[PDB]
Symmetry: C4
Subunit: 183 residues, 4 copies
Amino acid sequence: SLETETMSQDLMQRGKAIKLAVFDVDGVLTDGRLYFMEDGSEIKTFNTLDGQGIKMLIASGVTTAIISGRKTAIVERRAKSLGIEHLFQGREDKLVVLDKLLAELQLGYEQVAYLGDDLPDLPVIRRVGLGMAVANAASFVREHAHGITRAQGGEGAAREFCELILSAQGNLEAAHSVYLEGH
Amino acid sequence: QDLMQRGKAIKLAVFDVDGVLTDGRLYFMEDGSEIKTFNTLDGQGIKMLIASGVTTAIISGRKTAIVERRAKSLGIEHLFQGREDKLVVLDKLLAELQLGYEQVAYLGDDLPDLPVIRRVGLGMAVANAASFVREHAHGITRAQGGEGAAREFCELILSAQGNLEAAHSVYLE
Amino acid sequence: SQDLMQRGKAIKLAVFDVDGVLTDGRLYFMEDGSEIKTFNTLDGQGIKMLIASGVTTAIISGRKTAIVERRAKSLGIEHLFQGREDKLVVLDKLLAELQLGYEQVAYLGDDLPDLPVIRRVGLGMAVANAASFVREHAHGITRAQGGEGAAREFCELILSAQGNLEAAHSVYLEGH
Amino acid sequence: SQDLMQRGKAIKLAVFDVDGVLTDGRLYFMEDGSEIKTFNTLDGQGIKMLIASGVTTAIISGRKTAIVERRAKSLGIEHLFQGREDKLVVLDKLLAELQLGYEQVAYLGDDLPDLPVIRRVGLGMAVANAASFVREHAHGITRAQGGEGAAREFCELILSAQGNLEAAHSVYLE
Ligand SMILES: [Cl-]
Ligand SMILES: [Cl-]
Ligand SMILES: [Cl-]
Ligand SMILES: [Cl-]
């Protein structure tokens, strides 16, 4: 993309050490809309481009996680399908959850990328190696992030984030060559 | 700045539902049951406004259990549905809270919101409100309804009252 | 513009297609085959105001669903025809019954099946994202897209043409 | 473009991906796992007119749902292949059966699994919001986004290339 080709020196550098990529759900994997039916059940919407991006990222050896303040079986099903290894729902204390996971995984903050959209993501965004916000994240989150995606949440922002990491790590060309003969 | 001045005095913030907390779309299934959409940025904003001590209400000409549940999840204190005459509802609530019109902010989107918008301290329209409503409002949000308009309104009041910094500090330690 | 205002004066019947005009043109299907449809609140208010001014309303759609019957009833739309591809035939029958001529009809459409009606009526308009061929042959095009207040815009155009919008707005300047 | 008009002349089979082409790329899931999908009215009309002009149609999707089976039947799409991410393998088998060649195929895609087909066929096109790498390597890109009339635009490009759009429009001006 033009985003991976014009990726800043800073984001390219920050992408090098990444071993773990973490996503919030609402506003990142979705457009931030919450659909409710009369019985109180929810409908959730995700984006076709993001699944492909996450799959390519995982294939490159980067493990993935979701930390969400909300909880629904829709997300559990979505994550399992994609191959996301670590899912934490119903947690607004995102930093507490992250710390426990990094201790288990033996990783430092610099080895973590995170893509968020609102205030509860901020304590994590400020501390990780690659802390990014989607294009329509709360402006206060955008101002304190290392980078912002061109795409909006739920419209390929996760895909863009995945490709930034792949590109930073020298792995995007190989991922593309699976699909383009003589690339 | 007129809007910031209007915001200082606010003690009650009032929202319409369809077109303000939602994008104005009404979803119906074949048996007539409804689906409605809200926005996560809005929820965070309303929670922060409420935590600052500004109380909140909804007044809507429609009625659905969907809205009752959403209001409770957000901690919206006062909910009135199925009400055509919004000024009548507001007047009664104001007597209960011992407030006047100047201490009320309202975020609306169509004609039945206008009798209220014109009379309160901070009467605002969403970006895609009916043009006649926008014409008569004190201000118009950049955001469309259901797309963070309510978040923007909440932050306007928080900021007018010197409370946005403290809301934000919770996340910056 | 001044031509649309002129064409609006004579209107006694306003007719809508459903999908792409009162909706954004998305068709929602569930696994079990049933549908979901989305309408817009600004449009509802518009249609109610147009009806109150004395202009009757109708829907002619090629699709058929009980969702549309319910919506039409909620809004006070008097004449409803679904599952009808031959829109000009439907309209001609209705016009003979209401004793109205083409010049007294306004129609808001979005695709080719609407074109024969759009070309014959007094105020034949297309929504902003109607098929371009339809937009090219309509008397006018709404600024709003289908399902996003295009019907409201169309209703306000007719109310305005007849000098009735001012009064409809006036109610909402007063208190109770 | 005159290049696209040229490529469109020989088309006898037009093939679509589903998600992101016939839809805006949103995947709706209810708590019980059942899905909802949205199609576009303008697209349905376009596909019906294409089929009427003599061009057969097909869908090849890496996902799989009865929703797509019903939508395909409603539009008269003859050849439907779901749950297939090896798209050239599917297409090769279909062409052998129909006795058609790559030069007679148009394909409208949105993401990487579509790219091998897009590169092989006579008219490989991407939707406006296709993955940028796919857009860069297609013959052409629709002005319209997926699920917002891109399929209609693609249908009309073929109809026009084959001198058939006027005649389709006529039914509506008599
Ligand atoms: Cl996916
Ligand atoms: Cl929320
Ligand atoms: Cl309505
Ligand atoms: Cl259709």
